Symmetry: C2
Subunit: 144 residues, 2 copies
């Protein structure tokens, strides 16, 4: 099985996470399971899921939902674990990885799946995220 | 590597644990790591390590230390996870598995390693465990 390898990658990641600066934070069994590990953004740990609603075309129906993680844990090339927030823009969901915006969901490609108008509206909680800005948790390298 | 298989066993165990009645308890990265997983009692999860001191022969020196887990999580044949305490007797450390005392450290075999007198004294905290009794945490199937 190609999964036999997956369990191995996850284990090594957890070994690193266990020695990282975030080992003191609360980590549930769910936070560390394979299912989540293989969920976008992959190769990362994430906590604090937040619902992002996207409306394609000018219709409240046909409303797709996505999860924006309050905290995203990625590993630098050096192999060190950093913690950052998920950013929600009209373009999609991303996290800054070593200074660069990294998307794990592109709303344009998502609109090509549902929404002939090629138009979509992003809602995050009680805020409509259009413009060139975006919302994100306040999470940073600081340990919880 | 024979370890590649280990990571797999641990993962499946964690999948079961994640669905068990104890998934709500606090589980640290340490509690779920491979190193501990392969520590006695194996194939079990354990938390609340407690120091057990054993003195071989009539000497305070040559004092061996062992860990008695406040809570031992084993899986029944049916595959369900149960939680119980570690028992500290003069014979060794054990946990009751489906009504039967199960040792994961035998002090007699341990004395054969250090202590020609074939005699040993067991201390658990502020109590000397001789007689035919033993001390143990109050942990039971109840979730923390």
């Amino acid at each position: 099985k190609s999964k036999a390898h997956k369990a191995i990658e996850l284990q090594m990641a957890l070994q690193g996470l266990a020695q990282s600066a975030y080992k003191t934070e609360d980590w549930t069994l769910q936070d560390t399971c394979e299912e989540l590990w293989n969920t976008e953004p992959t190769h990362c740990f994430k906590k604090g899921g937040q619902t992002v609603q996207v409306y394609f075309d000018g219709n409240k129906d046909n409303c797709m939902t996505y999860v924006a993680w309050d905290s995203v844990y990625y590993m630098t090339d050096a192999g060190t674990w950093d913690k950052t927030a998920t950013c929600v823009s009209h373009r999609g969901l991303y996290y800054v990885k070593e200074g660069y915006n990294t998307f794990y969901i592109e709303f344009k490609s998502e609109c090509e799946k549902y929404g002939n108008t090629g138009t979509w509206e992003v809602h995050f909680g009680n805020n409509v995220i259009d413009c060139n800005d975006s919302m994100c948790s306040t999470s940073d390298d600081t340990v919880s």
